[PDB]
Amino acid sequence: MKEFYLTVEQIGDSIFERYIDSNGRERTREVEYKPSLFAHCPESQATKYFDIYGKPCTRKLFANMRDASQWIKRMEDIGLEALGMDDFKLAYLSDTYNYEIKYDHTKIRVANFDIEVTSPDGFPEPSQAKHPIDAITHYDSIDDRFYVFDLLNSPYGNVEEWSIEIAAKLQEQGGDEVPSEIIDKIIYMPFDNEKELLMEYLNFWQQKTPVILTGWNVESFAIPYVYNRIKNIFGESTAKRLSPHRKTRVKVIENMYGSREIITLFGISVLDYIDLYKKFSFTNQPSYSLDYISEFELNVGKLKYDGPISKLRESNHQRYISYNIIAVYRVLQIDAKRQFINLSLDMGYYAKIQIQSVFSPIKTWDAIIFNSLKEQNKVIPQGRSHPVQPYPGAFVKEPIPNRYKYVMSFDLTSLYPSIIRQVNISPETIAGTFKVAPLHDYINAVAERPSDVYSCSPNGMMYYKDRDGVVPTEITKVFNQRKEHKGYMLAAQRNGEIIKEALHNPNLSVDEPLDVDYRFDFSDEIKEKIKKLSAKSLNEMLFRAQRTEVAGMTAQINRKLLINSLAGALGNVWFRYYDLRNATAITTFGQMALQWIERKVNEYLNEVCGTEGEAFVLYGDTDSIYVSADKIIDKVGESKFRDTNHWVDFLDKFARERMEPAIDRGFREMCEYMNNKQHLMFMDREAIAGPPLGSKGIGGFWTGKKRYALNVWDMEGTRYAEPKLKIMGLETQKSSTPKAVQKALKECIRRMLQEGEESLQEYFKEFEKEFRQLNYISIASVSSANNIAKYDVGGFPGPKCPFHIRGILTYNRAIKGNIDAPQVVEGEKVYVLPLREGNPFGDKCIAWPSGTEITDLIKDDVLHWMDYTVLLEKTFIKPLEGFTSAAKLDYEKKASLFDMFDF
Template sequence: MGRSLTVQTFKGFLLTRNWRDTSHGVELEFWFTTGQGPLCAVVRGEHSVFFLVEDELGRAREILAVETTVKIKPVSLRSFSMAPVVGLYFNSYRQARRAADELRARGLDPLEADINPADRFLMERFVAGSAVLRGEPRRRGRHLMLENPVIKATQYRPTLKVVSFDIETAMEGLQLYCIAVHGTSIDGEARQVFMLGEGAQQAFVRSCANQGEVLQAFLDWVADYDPDVLIGWNVVNFDTWYLQRLADQLGRRLLLGRERRPGHWRELDDDGDRRTVQFPGRVVLDGIELLRAAFYRFESFSLENVSRQLLGTGKLLHGSDRGGEITRQFLQDKTSLARYNLKDCELVSEIFATTAILDFAVARSVMTGLNIDRMGASVASFDNLYLPRLHRQGYVAPNASSEQIASPGGFVLDSMPGIYDHVLVLDFKSLYPSIIRTFFIDPLGLALGVCGELAQPQTVPGFLEARFARRGHILPELIQQLWQQRDAAKESRDEPLSQAIKIIMNSFYGVLGTPGCRFFDARLASSITRRGHEILGRTRDYIEKAGHRVIYGDTDSVFVWIHDASSDAEAIAAGQQLQRDLNAWWCQVIRQEFDLESVLEVEFETHYKRFLMPTVRGSDKGSKKRYAGVVAGADGDKLVFKGLENVRTDWTRLARAFQEELYRRIFAQEPFEHYVKEQAASVLEGRCDAQLIYRKRLRRKLDEYQRNVPPHVQAARLCEERGLPVPSRGSWVEYVITTSGAEPVSAALAPLDYQHYVDRQLEPVADGILGFVGTSFRTLVDKQIDLF
């Protein structure tokens, strides 16, 4: 191992973190990517720490006497009950967990005992994603190493070296055909396919004699190319897990980490269907999970569908017999198989580039401190942001409460069904974060507000007898900082960072309302949602006193009918005036009633030229979270659907296309009667067969459906006997309704049940709007249907 002669400073982005117990204390390992290459920082001699209320120490000493290395130290911190606490320092994480479990078993309450040493080390230094490291570097193989460096927070956005990889396999068993890789870095692109057997003609294909050679050639290539990130499509639960099982079968290790180290697998559900893996120094990121985390929505997250929508191109093979065709190409046409395998890798690389989804992952990590491969984890994000600030204020966090009192959800106003001209949507910008900022809603603020140490004028009233301290709170300022950072990101057109901050801010209410959160308290969540109810209700009253009509409202938005507007311009002017008046009025109300400065902000968001609020199917009552309308677009008017069949993937393309055209005609006041009749006739004549496919996901395993077996499960259970792959939990099932019931679309034997599609797809869609124009589906088509 080479040694440097000088202390150096590095800026790096954190890829992975780990810790292990040693005879000399806890050892922490952090892998960073830096401008000088990969860097491993090792911190030795650390402790595992938790806290205990001082008054419980006497009862705890008998338990703690067993742990000979524990050190009890006074700390200048208090619990949420305002009691002083002591810090308990252990030489190993295992000892700390054992002691904490024993204390809980005796009825004591160790605080923050669930935080692992690596997370605490970074958190207390406010290191989130990026850091500046100072120390004497050593060369360890191809990488740099720092022992016990100084690590501080900084701002650093890395240029990551990325490899997209994909495997092709037989449909049964562990039979690997090939592995393709597509690397991207500042130095350009790299392509390679590792193929079992001879026959492929391309220069980028390397032929291997057996599966073990294919696997080893792939591992050698990755070690040589040395990427920071491995990406793919379902890459963790399929590709990487498949290679792990193959390596196990061959008696090898899957050494995909830096320094050729193996990964650590962890199951995310009881059935073992979902997993996560961490390789030291290298991150594996799944494109599907990342897009979902960034709130992308697709009818299907298949690589074929997503690439078609985002890139305008798709896979070289697709369809229900793709697995069989892959095997045929492996046996007969390895050149085509290599081309197909590599194309999948390139599609994933292009999707990542087009969406800037890796930039989003980096931005989220920099904001929350979580590893870039950790999806969801809103509670952990909140802890990372809140706990170090809490400690600086002189307090330690409570444990999650066993209290299960639910807070109410968002307020939904009763709707007024009908077809309207000139409906405006007025939206409170980030309502829940704005309520937190305005009314000082905060876990520490609540603890201070109800402890009895503050006079009532020093607090702000909440709900369920909550009171929040006017000073000393954390969350309102934290949200304000994030808000300012998001405004700056939008100003600089940093969309990934802006989106990451938006998701983080909007998650705070959900975290505080989650019983698994250590700060959960029904008074917190209720003081947000019930204040939101009050704000929405009073906003409606104000608008209606101004002479307009609120026909619907949901959580943070009101839908206002400007009934006296005779033009688009008049409606838009009314919306702009309401925006100004409401913002001024809310500032006045909150100042007068609470002596607070309001940060609530109403935005005039949308003008619907024509708008439909439907009824609940089969009744006269107005629906909720379902509507449609016409808005002005850059290329002319466009239809917007919310919650209706047009945007629901469990309805057929027939129903969605029919709804869009029927609504367009009615909104445009064009004739529609013949169109309805013609659509019914087309279905009955068999002219719409390609649009009759249902598509629904399996939420459970097939054998877990016992009663009320839905159609997609019925179809899935027919797959095996008809020579099709049996869908697993989470898979999409495509099926049609025939005269024999539901059957898989690629192996349906009975004739299609056309009457089913008229009755269950066309009629409900049509009657959602026809009643408002004085007719019904049956009135229009009954005579037409009698002809068939």
């Protein structure tokens, strides 16, 4: 076995490393690492070290790390660049692991934990830790066991032991429904006092020290609470045993409107699952309570209990403990699905960084580029100070608001990384500049050719063509990984649709799901066996295909994010390779590419249709074009098609055999015009969209930039069993829009695109009639809530107070002088409801914490004074009026001459 690190830290002049040795065992070592840094030297001096520009450098070896850091400061005092990796633990990792790391996850101790703290006087603040910790469940991945530490005696109540027998029972038996598959994996430990609980927890921690530490809100709550509680009871030295090197620090996390404190545990990598989820899930949720996310991800029910959480232990300790265990399990279930831990390990080891550094793409790229350059004996530049400056981004075409019946879209593969590779954009490949004409002149191919020697971007930048820069080289590697995983994702998607089709005709038999690899397109033999399977087996296969698709999605989308972030890192002042010339070279090239190809596609289609000056490209955003296919369908005639799938096949063939070759020729010409290193602008068909054949559906519509809806039959080669709505930007897609309203608007859109005006009118009339019956939570708006203090003037709205903030202030007055009432947390999300004139709350709206029922202190009054009329107009009617006006349809039936006959 090849060795690999687990954690690394600098503590004074020592590196502390936990690692897995060549025998598969966990070890710890302290190394008096002597770092090297670099200074420029005369050309006459012999060396093997050169900076990224080819200037010679001398290596300076220091007696210790403090000396190296002190030298950096003196070099600044003198006014000379101090070159090399100034983060010494990254240099240590590079020296110690000078090969591609192959890691074994089964040797890595991943701990998931959750704590309970009974608090009668509000939220138990981690910084204070004034209340006993009365439950800890700690799952260990190596043992595959849930360790449960249960406090039976507290100042807030003495309780009986938790019963595993009752826990396993159905809720209909009075049990807690702790999943049968984890019942045998629970190791239960009751304690008669908190001191013994915490002492045993620390001994346990010492025996089974987490490498990766995760859970839900562990970084902001569980970890600081445990640390501060142990500190309060036993003193600092005991609390620091949570670090394998006995070193901790309070770290201040600063944001624009305040700060918070966390505990850094040296020698542990904390990956709080709430933060993994926010970074890697590509969702925006109305609430981030574990309950809300578990329901969303797993379709598991809410963990139900009576009374407030502050009385749950006292009233129902059995359920209190069971729910603590289930909470830990739900995070593991989410990870089994999403695989964010696996992703973090993959990317961390690839870059050779502390695993927790995967949250920072700048840190990630700094390490990848450093390791790459080091291998060539090249020396990285010193990081410099830069003022933050704005720079231009993508082009977005202004669409004509309208219905659009038949639409085919086309999209460039990994645009920004492909631009970097094509142009050869890198710190060390800058060759100079040329005199820029207006962008319009390059788009229309009338500007003079920028260069006959160098590779160019229309922002004026020129790049070397003799060899790839380090940025293009390293971005290509991660791009290739992304491409592989996307392949697996798309195959699983296509396989899912095969199963959906088979589910139309399930067989009446008892059988089992097929053992197959969903990452690869099903063979003919598998397809034949699938046609003979029962619904139970097919549904099990569908679930497995969809889980495979999710795994592929996680792996691909976040690798996409990583490579895209390199383009943005070039525009971030903290990146070692910050250069607005390079950042702008990327975005400006993108603007040209989109508008260039718009012109080319319009020219091609005008030629094939025999017209002049007609716009076939109706829209584009960044790297995509949307093409009207009405005329293409009309040339064959709608009556000539047997069914919907027939014209979809036809448009698919037209895009692949005629349009893509024309698009490719257009981009190859653009490559020559800019004299680029390599043609990498690959624009493939994305969506085929239209109404069902023979229906009155409108197919699609646009209301404006970044606001449209399409009825899609085929997406990137996936032919759907049922048509799929692609809706971007509209209120159905916004977390701020009430849940039931999202649903209603989506059905309105479905009816518009698939069925027509009359169907839409029927549904509107019904929703308007019935909506007052909807649950208040389902019709509440959602908003993030920043700067509550700023707009608070003695409990009342100050000047320019935002609507959602006004709601919070209203809530605050209504719960005034009440410790048990849920508090709205600064920077978190709230539900918002309008209030009718003359209500007892004394204002036009109220807001409360999202993902929760409003406190019984005011619930019935909120329900009684809810302004349903305002709700409907603002969240439903106004957006719908926008959709229908754009589509040129009416959501209410207009008066006609036939009304004079009504019978």
